[PDB]
Amino acid sequence: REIVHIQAGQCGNQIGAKFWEVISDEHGIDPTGSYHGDSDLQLERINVYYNEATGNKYVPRAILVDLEPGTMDSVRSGPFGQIFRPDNFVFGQSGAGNNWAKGHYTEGAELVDSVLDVVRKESESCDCLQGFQLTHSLGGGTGSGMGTLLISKIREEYPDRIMNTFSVMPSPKVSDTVVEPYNATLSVHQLVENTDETYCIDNEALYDICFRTLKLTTPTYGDLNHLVSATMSGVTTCLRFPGQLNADLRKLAVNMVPFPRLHFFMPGFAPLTLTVPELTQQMFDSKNMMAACDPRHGRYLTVAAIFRGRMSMKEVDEQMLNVQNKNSSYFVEWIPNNVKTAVCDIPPRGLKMSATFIGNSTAIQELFKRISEQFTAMFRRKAFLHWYTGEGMDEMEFTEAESNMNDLVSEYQQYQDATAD
Amino acid sequence: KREHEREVIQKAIEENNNFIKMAKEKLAQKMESNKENREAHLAAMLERLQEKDKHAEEVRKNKELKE
Amino acid sequence: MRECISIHVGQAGVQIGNACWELYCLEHGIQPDGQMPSDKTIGGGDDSFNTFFSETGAGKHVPRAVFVDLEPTVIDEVRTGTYRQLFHPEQLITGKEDAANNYARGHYTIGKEIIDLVLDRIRKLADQCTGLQGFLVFHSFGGGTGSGFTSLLMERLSVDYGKKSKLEFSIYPAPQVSTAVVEPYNSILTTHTTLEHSDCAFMVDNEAIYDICRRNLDIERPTYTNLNRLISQIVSSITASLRFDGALNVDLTEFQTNLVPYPRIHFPLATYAPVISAEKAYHEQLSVAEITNACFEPANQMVKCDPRHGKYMACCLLYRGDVVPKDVNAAIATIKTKRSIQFVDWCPTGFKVGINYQPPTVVPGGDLAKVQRAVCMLSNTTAIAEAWARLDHKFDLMYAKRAFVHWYVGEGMEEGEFSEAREDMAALEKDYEEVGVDSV
Ligand SMILES: Nc1nc2c(ncn2[C@@H]2O[C@H](COP(=O)(O)OP(=O)(O)OP(=O)(O)O)[C@@H](O)[C@H]2O)c(=O)[nH]1
Ligand SMILES: Nc1nc2c(ncn2[C@@H]2O[C@H](COP(=O)(O)OP(=O)(O)O)[C@@H](O)[C@H]2O)c(=O)[nH]1
Ligand SMILES: [Ca+2]
Ligand SMILES: [Mg+2]
Numbered sequence: 001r002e003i004v005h006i007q008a009g010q011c012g013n014q015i016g017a018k019f020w021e022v023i024s025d026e027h028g029i030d031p032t033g034s035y036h037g038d039s040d041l042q043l044e045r046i047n048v049y050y051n052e053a054t055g056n057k058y059v060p061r062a063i064l065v066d067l068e069p070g071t072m073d074s075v076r077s078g079p080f081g082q083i084f085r086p087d088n089f090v091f092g093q094s095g096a097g098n099n100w101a102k103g104h105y106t107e108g109a110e111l112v113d114s115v116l117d118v119v120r121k122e123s124e125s126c127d128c129l130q131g132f133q134l135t136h137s138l139g140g141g142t143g144s145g146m147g148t149l150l151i152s153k154i155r156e157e158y159p160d161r162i163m164n165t166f167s168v169m170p171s172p173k174v175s176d177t178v179v180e181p182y183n184a185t186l187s188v189h190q191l192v193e194n195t196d197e198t199y200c201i202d203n204e205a206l207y208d209i210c211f212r213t214l215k216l217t218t219p220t221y222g223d224l225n226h227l228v229s230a231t232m233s234g235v236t237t238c239l240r241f242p243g244q245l246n247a248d249l250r251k252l253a254v255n256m257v258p259f260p261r262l263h264f265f266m267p268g269f270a271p272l273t274l275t276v277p278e279l280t281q282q283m284f285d286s287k288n289m290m291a292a293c294d295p296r297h298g299r300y301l302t303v304a305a306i307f308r309g310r311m312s313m314k315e316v317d318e319q320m321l322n323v324q325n326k327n328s329s330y331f332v333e334w335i336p337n338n339v340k341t342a343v344c345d346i347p348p349r350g351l352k353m354s355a356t357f358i359g360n361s362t363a364i365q366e367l368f369k370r371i372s373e374q375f376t377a378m379f380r381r382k383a384f385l386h387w388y389t390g391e392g393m394d395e396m397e398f399t400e401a402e403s404n405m406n407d408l409v410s411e412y413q414q415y416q417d418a419t420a421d
Numbered sequence: 422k423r424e425h426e427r428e429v430i431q432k433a434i435e436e437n438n439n440f441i442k443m444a445k446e447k448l449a450q451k452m453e454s455n456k457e458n459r460e461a462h463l464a465a466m467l468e469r470l471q472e473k474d475k476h477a478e479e480v481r482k483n484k485e486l487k488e
Numbered sequence: 489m490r491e492c493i494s495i496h497v498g499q500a501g502v503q504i505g506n507a508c509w510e511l512y513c514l515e516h517g518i519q520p521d522g523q524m525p526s527d528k529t530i531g532g533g534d535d536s537f538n539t540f541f542s543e544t545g546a547g548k549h550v551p552r553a554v555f556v557d558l559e560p561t562v563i564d565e566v567r568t569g570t571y572r573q574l575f576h577p578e579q580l581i582t583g584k585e586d587a588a589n590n591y592a593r594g595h596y597t598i599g600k601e602i603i604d605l606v607l608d609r610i611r612k613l614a615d616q617c618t619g620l621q622g623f624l625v626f627h628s629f630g631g632g633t634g635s636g637f638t639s640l641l642m643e644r645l646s647v648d649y650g651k652k653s654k655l656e657f658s659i660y661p662a663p664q665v666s667t668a669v670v671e672p673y674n675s676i677l678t679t680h681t682t683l684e685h686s687d688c689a690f691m692v693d694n695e696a697i698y699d700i701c702r703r704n705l706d707i708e709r710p711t712y713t714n715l716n717r718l719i720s721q722i723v724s725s726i727t728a729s730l731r732f733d734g735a736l737n738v739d740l741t742e743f744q745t746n747l748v749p750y751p752r753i754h755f756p757l758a759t760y761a762p763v764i765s766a767e768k769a770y771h772e773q774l775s776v777a778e779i780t781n782a783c784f785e786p787a788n789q790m791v792k793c794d795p796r797h798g799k800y801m802a803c804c805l806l807y808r809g810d811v812v813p814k815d816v817n818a819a820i821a822t823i824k825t826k827r828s829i830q831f832v833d834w835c836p837t838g839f840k841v842g843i844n845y846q847p848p849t850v851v852p853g854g855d856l857a858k859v860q861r862a863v864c865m866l867s868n869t870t871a872i873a874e875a876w877a878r879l880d881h882k883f884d885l886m887y888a889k890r891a892f893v894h895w896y897v898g899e900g901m902e903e904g905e906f907s908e909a910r911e912d913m914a915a916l917e918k919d920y921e922e923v924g925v926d927s928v
Contacts (some may be wrong), residue, residue: 001584105480128584156470159463193469242561245667250588255669258891302669313709317664334885336672337663392484418889437650442647442686444646455596464896 001128003239003249005062005135006120006150009096009143010071011168012136013064014221015199015296017075018229019135020060023049023240024080027073027348031056031080031272039345044242051125058086063118065150067092067107067142074210088122096141098100100183101391103145110270112149119154124418130249131162131196132231135232138187139170139180144232148190155194162249164197166232169291169367171204172374174224179384181374182398188368189401191264192408196253196366198264199235199358200367201228204292213272213287229347231267231290234356238342245342246304255340256302256360268357279355280319284327288357291367298363299416303339309353310345317341362416365409372405490539491617492730493610494553494624497641498587498594498633499562500659501626502555503712507720507851508626509551510571512731514539514849515724521573522548534735542616552613554579556606556641558598558633559586579613581606587632589668591677592899594636597692602642607648614649621643621741622653622687624727630661630671635678642685647926654743655688657723660791660875665712670892672882674908679876680909683916688744690726690866691875692719693791700788702764717854722760722790725806725864728844736813739841746802746840748842752919753801757872758790759783759865769857776815776861777822780805783865784827791875796828798871799924803829804840809847809861816841831928846868878914 007016024030029048035043035058050058062084066072069091075081076089092111097102123129132154136143151163167187170180182367191198206227208220235413238246245254257263267290270282283305286294307316320341324331331338347355378384389395494928496505516537518524524547526535532543541549557563560582566572567580583602587594614620623645630636645654661671668674682689697718701710729740748754761782762774782788783805786795807816820839823829831837848862886892887906897903 102479105477106484109477109481152470152473156467156474159466210650246587248588251668254589254892257895258669258886258889260894317709334889335669335886335891336882337666338669340666340669390484390487392480392482392487415889420885431805441647441650444643448643448647452600454598454902455592457900459597459898459900464902 001047001130002061002126003130004122004126004132005049006065006119006132007061007062007329008065008134008136008147008150009140010066010068011140012134012143012147013066013071013075015166015168015225015228015232016062016064016135017078017080018225019232020062020083021080022229022233023236024083026346027058027240029058029082029083032296033059033083039346041242045240048130048239059083061122062088063115064089065111065115065121065142065146067103067111067146068095069093084329088118090118097184097260098139098177098179098183099387099391100145100186100276101293101388101393103141103143103147104123104149104186105393106391108142108146108149112153114412115150116153116157120157123158129158129161131158131164133161134165136165137168137170139175139177139186140183142188144183146182148187148194151190151194160241162196162253163194164199164249165191165195166199166201167191169200169202169204169371171202171207173207174203179387181371181378182384182388182415183406185375186397186399188371189404192404196263197249197256199231200264200291200364201231201267202291202367205290208292209272209287227269227290231269231356232236233348234269234306234308235267235358237344237356241346245340245345252304256304256358257303258360259411259415261408262301262360264360264413266293266359266361266364267293267358270355271351273350274353276315277319279307279353280323283355283357284323287413291364292370293361293363295330295359295361295363295367297366298330298361298412300338300361301415302357302360303333304358305339305341305354306344306358307341307353308344308355309347311343311353313343316343317421332415332417332418360376362412365412368405368409372402372409375402489534489619490621490730491552491619492539492621492624492727493613493617494540494626495641496553496625497625497638498557498631500628500631500634502557502562502566504626504657504716504719504723505553505555506566506569507716508723509553509574511720511724511849512572513574514851515846516541516731518549519668520571522550523881524549524558524836530805534692537731538620539730540727550574550576551579552617553765554581554606554609554613556581556602556637557586558583558594558602560584578609581609585637588615589630589674590632590895590899591639591674592896592901594632594634595640595662596901597899599637599640600925603644603770606641607644610645611648613651619637620649620652622655624655624657624773626657627663628659629675629678630659630668632674633658635674639678639681642682644827647683653687656682656683656686656690658691660691660693660879663777663785664698665715666695670895672879672886673815673892673896674915676883676909677905680912683752683912686754688748688756689759691755691791691872692722692758692917693875696790696792700763701855703787705765707855709887714855716881717851717856718763721848721856722758722864723807724848725760725862726758726866728808728846729806729842732844732846734843734845736841736843738840743804743840743842743866746804747866749801749835749868750919750923752916753868753923755872756866757793757795757869759867760790761863762790762859763788764857764859765855766857769859774859774861776807776811777819779861780819780823783863784823784829791872793869793871793874795867795869798869800829800831800867800869801923802840802868804866806844806864806866807861808863809859811843811861813841813843815821817841832924870920870924873917876913876917876920880910883910
């Protein structure tokens with residue numbers, strides 16, 4: 001049944017706004033919240049993301065959070081600003097300052113109770129809550145710190161509900177802030193313990209796709225978010241339309257997560273703006289991944305593929321087998337039948353057919369290794385720590401966060417090197 | 422023979438009644454043990470989250486005494 | 489008299505139930521509203537079709553059925569569909585939250601909340617029965633509800649109804665139409681817990697039914713509707729013994745007597761013929777000899793195994809339609825000389841035949857052709873242990889690394905239950921060896 005969306009910080013509210021832009025378009029919901037669509041095979045599972053207010057109005061089950069009021073006001077003036085319920089906007093006064101400690105412990109802790117009041121109001125109205133999804137970044141302050149605090153706080157009141165998340169990773173290519181490896185490593189510490197299924201949206205991968213593949217010398221956030229919105233639409237297709245396979249967040253978690261800590265996925269998408277072999281060949285390719293990791297450098301524990309558009313289901317079964325059989329080295333032998341596939345007749349906007357990829361590869365360690373270097377290069381000489389230790393933290397937490405993320409890398413390596421006998 | 426005939430039908434009733442009784446006690450013990458285990462996991466999950474909240478209070482209080 | 493109560497658990501169970509009861513209605517001449525012009529006795533009676541249908545004073549023929557699922561969407565289609573008036577709403581039981589392909593959620597967490605309600609509705613059907621013969625339980629091995637809740641139900645039905653008969657129609661998992669990675673766990677857990685509480689169990693490999701639909705009916709990519717309609721024909725052939733009565737129609741319990749030599753060895757291999765398209769059916773008079781020969785070709789089996797590399801402990805032939813004993817005896821004589829039919833030395837090598845003169849119907853606008861005669865072979869062979877071996881091997885690969893185990897442990901289960909269930913499968917695999925091996 002119901003999923004409660006949350007968007008935290010500048011990044012989280014922008015990609016969240018673009019997510020609600022695209023899925024409202026797919027379900028045939030205009031900015032006034034009115035249904036004007038052609039198919040019913042749009043309203044069947046509309047209640048997963050929308051509430052039915054009086055006048056046949058469809059309002060997103062979305063909660064907009066930020067310590068900065070500026071980024072939230074830009075959402076209300078955007079294309080789908082008025083569709084959101086006005087009470088769900090939970091704005092702060094101070095601002096983040098790109099500090100995880102301010103987001104997690106002090107200034108974000110001031111605001112966290114007023115967010116929970118909206119969450120509890122939305123969750124009480126649900127017939128059967130699946131769980132929650134948080135769109136946010138790990139580099140900044142609000143989305144990084146307060147987002148992980150919200151997860152911990154919501155886990156406390158809803159311990160048997162799913163908590164997935166769409167975590168945007170930092171990169172030197174896109175971002176200029178130097179403290180982001182601290183913020184990311186501190187956030188990853190929390191996500192390892194308190195989330196069921198994280199989609200790793202890497203800004204390095206989105207830059208490289210925009211620069212190399214899409215061929216853009218000047219890649220804006222709008223160019224990056226076009227890929228993210230298309231990815232987010234793809235991975236939630238089985239949740240949003242009447243489908244056989246992985247219709248809820250728990251079933252996806254049961255299929256994709258063999259071990260509790262290893263729940264950090266590698267999303268993929270094709271085509272990047274066309275036959276089924278070409279779609280299948282593109283979606284598994286390293287250049288179509290939204291995490292900057294080569295899957296040839298590791299092994300797939302579990303995979304989920306979502307094909308969209310009218311196509312031969314016979315052909316989809318063959319091509320998904322042909323890539324599996326002829327690349328069997330890159331799938332663990334000790335999880336048989338680990339690649340599941342779903343079909344959906346309704347394609348995305350513009351495309352005739354598309355394919356979305358969700359992969360729990362061991363090669364995701366490359367992402368966490370890259371963050372660990374950028375963390376350690378600064379942390380060896382205790383650089384920029386007065387920002388955090390002034391806020392009330394101590395060097396234990398950084399030592400713990402470093403060690404906990406390096407354990408995650410060792411665990412991904414441990415099961416990569418694992419064998420049948 | 423009549424005494425043996427009564428012994429057979431009673432033994433048949435004994436087998437059914439023991440099967441019902443053994444099935445009931447196996448299930449009752451399984452559902453009780455499972456209830457205890459699931460509640461123990463949610464206890465440890467919230468006891469972890471409260472230790473995070475206790476630690477979070479020791480950051481607010483620690484910033485208070487750094488001036 | 490001789491009433492049978494069918495129980496349909498989870499997705500697969502309900503949707504096969506949809507196919508089965510639709511097919512039964514067409515065979516008996518029961519309309520979608522429950523009316524039956526053939527039936528002159530209004531309000532009740534003791535006809536053979538009344539073993540599966542209770543009757544109301546208004547002339548409605550209500551299935552002796554209970555539909556159960558932990559989420560509503562599949563049973564909502566029964567409430568909305570063509571045969572919505574056929575059922576009383578109390579027979580159709582639904583929850584909100586499903587078992588998420590988890591035996592633990594289906595058996596313990598979610599199942600406990602609805603189990604008492606389901607047993608109340610089964611009791612209300614049982615009180616209508618002058619005499620209750622037993623239950624037919626329809627479920628999947630792979631699903632959370634299908635595995636978990638069925639195991640809970642089968643345990644509770646043993647307590648409430650004692651030694652009363654309990655038959656299973658079980659959907660064995662296949663990767664072509666699979667829904668979860670953890671289906672081997674759910675299969676081994678449900679098989680272990682249900683083994684003592686089931687008197688006979690008809691396994692149905694989706695891979696076998698899927699391949700038959702592709703090979704015989706020439707269907708590119710068979711849907712669940714394609715599988716279920718084929719599966720309903722085998723279920724109909726097996727249950728035709730209870731629902732009709734000729735002189736050669738032998739009761740289901742009389743087959744049980746032959747099919748189950750030891751309590752644990754109660755998994756008959758079912759084979760069916762002819763499966764043929766309407767395009768091809770046109771002007772091929774399929775004789776008794778041809779359809780009986782097809783029962784020993786392993787392409788037409790419901791479980792993928794090799795009886796040739798195994799040993800028969802029983803072999804029953806359930807014919808229906810235009811068949812006489814003279815043609816059956818001639819075909820069996822022809823087959824006995826030509827085929828590999830090796831029996832164990834402790835059992836007689838005869839073939840138990842039953843004939844049911846009412847011919848097989850098909851759903852209009854179906855893929856399956858209307859044929860004048862058909863057969864379903866039920867055989868207790870040691871080769872069906874190959875099905876356990878394939879399933880136990882997939883368990884071993886994942887369980888060795890404790891893959892996906894935390895999902896079960898998080899819902900209250902222990903690692904003890906896994907190894908205890910697996911040892912029972914190892915014992916069962918060993919039992920099938922012991923019965924097959926030659927004697928002192
Ligand atoms: N033959 C056949 N098999 C089915 C059908 N529906 C599902 N299955 C099989 O059942 C297995 C999955 O279990 P389901 O029965 O869908 O799950 P469930 O029992 O509803 O349990 P939850 O969904 O977890 O509550 C898969 O291996 C499917 O191939 C059907 O209509 N026919
Ligand atoms: N992909 C993407 N990344 C963003 C966007 N906005 C900010 N970011 C990233 O988020 C990080 C900074 O977090 P931000 O959300 O601005 O801080 P907060 O508002 O305090 O949470 C940087 O690494 C940015 O690259 C966006 O619209 N798209
Ligand atoms: Ca009658
Ligand atoms: Mg289901």
